[PDB]
Amino acid sequence: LAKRIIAALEVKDGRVVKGTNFENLRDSGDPAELGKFYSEIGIDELVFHDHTASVEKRKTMLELVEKVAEQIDIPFTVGGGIHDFETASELILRGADKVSINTAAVENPSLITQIAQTFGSQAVVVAIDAKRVDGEFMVFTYSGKKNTGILLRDWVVEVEKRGAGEILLTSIDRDGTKSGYDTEMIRFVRPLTTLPIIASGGAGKMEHFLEAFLAGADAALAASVFHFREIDVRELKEYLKKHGVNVRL
């Protein structure tokens, strides 16, 4: 099955947060320029997660989307504080291919269906942040601050029922570490859904990507390993292809 390598760019006020090690760029903090660069070195898709203050957030995210869309021809997803249909709609119309929803989806699962009814299931990425609590995988909202008491098992099934197109599955246990993707979590989710699963959290070395794909991920997302050039994207794809993973070269 075909596998995707996805770069996540954390943004705020139209700037990439903590930038990159790429000396070749005019501006290593320019999300559009960085996105273009990633598409040229072989990234399959981009995910932008915005952290801009409330007063300028809506306009800032729309400007980001417009600027990014001019520079790239590969799919991109935008998210971070999308709480209703109109916000999602404006972002897709302005150029995003997909939107990520998380806290708002948990609080109002019909939001998934609402977006999907106009933009198709393929436009809706449900980001699920999960962690082990007393031996069970639980869903967390508010940037991992709130244990919802909802079992990951139940939420995955509901997300697909509501019409999501893809699940962006972040293990809070691994996110920010470089210890590996949470392959147990990925394997737990795999049989519960037909949807593409984007593995997120824990990437540290090329072998972690192989492990994630063996676990049943359809895509693997990473940020700082790419931005700080711990992993070269071309080298990663060549590595994965060598070991039998169907990646696009």
Tokens standing for 198? 């984007």
- What does the alpha-carbon distance between residue 39 and residue 142 come to, in Å, rounded to a whole number? 30
- Could you list the beta-strand ranges (E) of the chain: 2-12, 15-16, 45-50, 76-79, 98-101, 124-133, 136-141, 146-151, 166-171, 197-200, 219-222, 246-247
DSSP code at position 8: E
Please enumerate in sequence order all residues whose Cβ is within 8 A of that of 105, keeping only pairs 6 or more positions apart, or say none.
Answer: 111, 112, 126, 159, 164
- What does the alpha-carbon distance between residue 27 and residue 30 come to, in Å, rounded to a whole number? 5
What is the enclosing helix (H) or strand (E) of 38? helix 31-41
Q: Which 3 state secondary structure label does DSSP give 7?
A: strand
DSSP code at position 81: S
Q: Which residues pair with 148 in a beta bridge?
A: none
- What does the alpha-carbon distance between residue 53 and residue 80 come to, in Å, rounded to a whole number? 11
Contact status, residue 188 vs residue 197, Cβ threshold 8 Å? no
- What does the alpha-carbon distance between residue 209 and residue 7 come to, in Å, rounded to a whole number? 13
- What does the alpha-carbon distance between residue 150 and residue 133 come to, in Å, rounded to a whole number? 11
Domains of the chain, each with CATH number or no CATH: 2-247 (3.20.20.70)
DSSP code at position 146: E
The CA-atom distances, in angstroms, between 58 and each of 6, 70, 103, 111 are 24, 19, 17, 18
Pairing verdict, β 146-151 and 166-171? unpaired
Residue 210 phi/psi, 5° resolution? -55, -50
**Experimental method, per PDB record:** X-ray
Pairing verdict, β 2-12 and 219-222? parallel
